[PDB]
Design a protein around this ligand. Sequence first.
Ligand code: AS9
Ligand code: AS9
Ligand code: ZN
Ligand code: ZN
Lengths: 301, 301
Amino acid sequence: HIQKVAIFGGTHGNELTGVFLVKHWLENGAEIQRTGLEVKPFITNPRAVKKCTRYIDCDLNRIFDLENLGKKMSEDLPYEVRRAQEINHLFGPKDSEDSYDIIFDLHNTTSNMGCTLILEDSRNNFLIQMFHYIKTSLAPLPCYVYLIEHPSLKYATTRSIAKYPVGIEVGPQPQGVLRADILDQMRKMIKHALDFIHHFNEGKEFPPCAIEVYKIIEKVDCPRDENGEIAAIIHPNLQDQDWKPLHPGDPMFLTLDGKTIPLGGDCTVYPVFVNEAAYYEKKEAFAKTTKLTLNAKSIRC
Amino acid sequence: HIQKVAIFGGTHGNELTGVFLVKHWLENGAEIQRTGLEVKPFITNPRAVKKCTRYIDCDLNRIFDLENLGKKMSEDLPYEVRRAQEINHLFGPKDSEDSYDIIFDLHNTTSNMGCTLILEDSRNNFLIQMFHYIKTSLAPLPCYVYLIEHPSLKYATTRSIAKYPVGIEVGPQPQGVLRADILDQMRKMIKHALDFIHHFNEGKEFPPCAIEVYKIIEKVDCPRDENGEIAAIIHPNLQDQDWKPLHPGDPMFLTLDGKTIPLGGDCTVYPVFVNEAAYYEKKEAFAKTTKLTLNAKSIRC
Ligand SMILES: CP(=O)(O)N[C@@H](CC(=O)O)C(=O)O
Ligand SMILES: CP(=O)(O)N[C@@H](CC(=O)O)C(=O)O
Ligand SMILES: [Zn+2]
Ligand SMILES: [Zn+2]
């Protein structure tokens, strides 16, 4: 019932856990094969990987949409646009029924997020169930679900080609660096994800379940100069405390002088992607989330 | 007696602690001024800083030597070569008596080295004394001295222009990221360094002293493919254990299949710059050092 599965690595070329795993699995997929399940590992941005850079012309993971995927194939096209098409053709088309069933996009963050799963749809019982299985399997190792469903802030990811897109994000890891513990953590996330798909194709019935997710609400920039240069930094107490609750009282930023700037607003939030290297460019110091619980109905077949 | 002092930041454009401190100090040097001491903060690689990249055409901190500094000023010269000259003219010439007395070059590492001082000369009583002062001042906060003196492996640093070159290195920090705790640690290293120069120019007498240093002996690459691609990774037990002793028995690398590769050789070593992002390009997984004690004679002004 689920037949076509891919694992993407190297969507960003300087996030090496995915690149390294995939390169190995292309030479020996044993670890990712399951009986009755054919899984294809793939390097999405081979050129950014070669320059150990994040992208060449633009962020690949933001352009899998109509505006871009419908463009006439040319050679004056940004590399990543030319490439998003090549990928849509191989694992899609997006929104077609010939699309791959499931795509896992592998990712790293400099933030201290631990094992993270990214959910694009708050009503996909199938994914919710997958995520619950992985969570439960990993325990007591924590695992967190970032829900990026938003009327305007949902971006068009590489993995959104599939009917079931899955983001796998593990941190903290500096860009351009290959840590062993981070690699082990990612592997295990995948083992349990594939294990769940097998169990499902073997007709196992899953009761209802609830999981905690963190829902995007707003992205915060750091204080800036009169000239638009960085004017404070992530307060020591906020640094590395991804996922933990931050109340309106508490410290957010720190100047050199160094006055503390506190949260404000009227409600507790849960920060994610705190001090992510790649978001300095995007003017995002961190993202605010509300914690909530989602339910899945049972599923089978 | 010491008059001309500089602080370099942004030698590598993606190491932001230095860039940030310097940019601020150019607008208000109060923190780095001392009575009778005029100290100049400077951005060494302004262009790499703008691209938040490490270098543009080549590593700036390896070319302050005759081969490069004697090249005819042209415009077909790598940016960094063109720039090393501009810098030699402003704070040197290297090997002249008009050179600045002291240059501090600020740096960041993805390795877990904490506060680090880099010594280019094992006989410079003046530096040894400085370093001893900083070490003892910082305590119990650790501080380590990396001695790069070698017949062939001493590289020609930006700071080597001065009579007294000083490398200030603080980790771990991902590239392109501004951590607050790392910034505090660097500031304090500088406060105590300037404090020591003041004390010296005020005629304070310093008795003899001993300090421990870690001396470069050999740089190690990671195991490679038949095609020269990375084949193992820093073993979990070696990761993050910069400075601590590694015996010939102990694990060094780890393959994807779980196979451990151990140290070998015949003597204990002390690894430094373990899993430094910037040394993937240079084929250096980490550097082996022998621990040594150095002595300074007393000094006065
Ligand atoms: C810090 P990252 O590059 O792993 N973040 C992705 C988020 C994702 O994978 O959905 C992005 O910027 O598009
Ligand atoms: C990790 P880094 O690039 O700050 N290390 C310096 C070391 C130094 O300052 O001597 C270098 O590669 O030249
Ligand atoms: Zn990413
Ligand atoms: Zn550096």
